[PDB]
Each structure stands twice: as structure tokens, then as C-alpha cells.
Amino acid sequence: SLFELGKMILQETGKNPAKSYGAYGCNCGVLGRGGPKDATDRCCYVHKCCYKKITGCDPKKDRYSYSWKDKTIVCGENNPCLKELCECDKAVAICLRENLGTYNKKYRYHLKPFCKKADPC
Numbered sequence: 001s002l003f004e005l006g007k008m009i010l011q012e013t014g015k016n017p018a019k020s021y022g023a024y025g026c027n028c029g030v031l032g033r034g035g036p037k038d039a040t041d042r043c044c045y046v047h048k049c050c051y052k053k054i055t056g057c058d059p060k061k062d063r064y065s066y067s068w069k070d071k072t073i074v075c076g077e078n079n080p081c082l083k084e085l086c087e088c089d090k091a092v093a094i095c096l097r098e099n100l101g102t103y104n105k106k107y108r109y110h111l112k113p114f115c116k117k118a119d120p121c
């Protein structure tokens with residue numbers, strides 16, 4: 001659900017997920033995707049595509065379990081939708097941490113119809 005995802009982001013990036021990522025670029029994050037604005041914005045774009053190939057569960061609402069072991073998000077699920085969900089959220093979080101150096105506050109509260117239409121996933 002959002003709690004797990006924001007936690008992962010927080011734990012990986014060290015940033016307040018809602019602040020840094022709640023409204024960042026054309027895809028990070030809360031209302032569809034869009035021509036990524038940069039590395040960070042592209043992370044959320046893949047995250048959404050990752051979301052859409054998900055079936056038995058809702059990624060806003062369904063909670064899953066995960067572990068922090070050796071400073072690594074370890075998914076705790078066998079359930080397929082939750083495992084993939086957990087893995088989509090995990091990878092979004094990694095990807096956001098890896099691209100922090102290009103993170104640009106200029107796109108933090110970007111207005112989202114200032115966004116080009118996204119390519120199908």
C-alpha cells in the first residue's frame with residue numbers, strides 16, 4: 001500500500017516520500033504517468049508501468065510485509081500480486097535513491113498537464 005512504498009522510499013532515499021516524491025515530475029507521483037522529466041521522474045514512470053501488470057491486488061491499499069535486512073528491502077511475501085507489488089515498490093525506491101543526484105526541486109510540485117502524454121507501457 002502507500003505505507004509500505006513510502007517507507008521504502010524513505011529508508012532508501014532518506015527523504016520524506018511525500019515531500020520529495022508525492023508530486024514530482026510527470027509521474028512521481030499520484031495521477032498517471034507522463035513524459036518523464038528526468039532520472040527521478042523516470043523512476044516513478046517505470047513504477048507505474050510496474051503497477052499496471054499487477055492483477056490480484058490493489059497497490060494503493062493492499063499491505064504486504066517486508067523486512068529491512070542488511071539495509072536491503074527484503075520482500076516478505078509469497079502471494080504473487082503482493083510479491084510483485086512489493087518488488088515494484090522496492091525497485092521504485094532503489095531507483096529513486098540511485099538518481100538522487102539529478103533530483104531537481106524545480107519539478108517537485110510540477111503541474112501535471114504541463115506533461116506530455118505517456119507512451120503505452
Ligand SMILES: CCCCCCCCCCCCCC(=O)O
Nearest residue numbers: 003006007017018021028029044
Ligand atoms: C513514511 C510513511 C510513508 C507514507 C506516505 C506516502 C508516500 C507517498 C509517496 C510515494 C512516491 C511514489 C508514489 C507513486 O508514484 O505512486
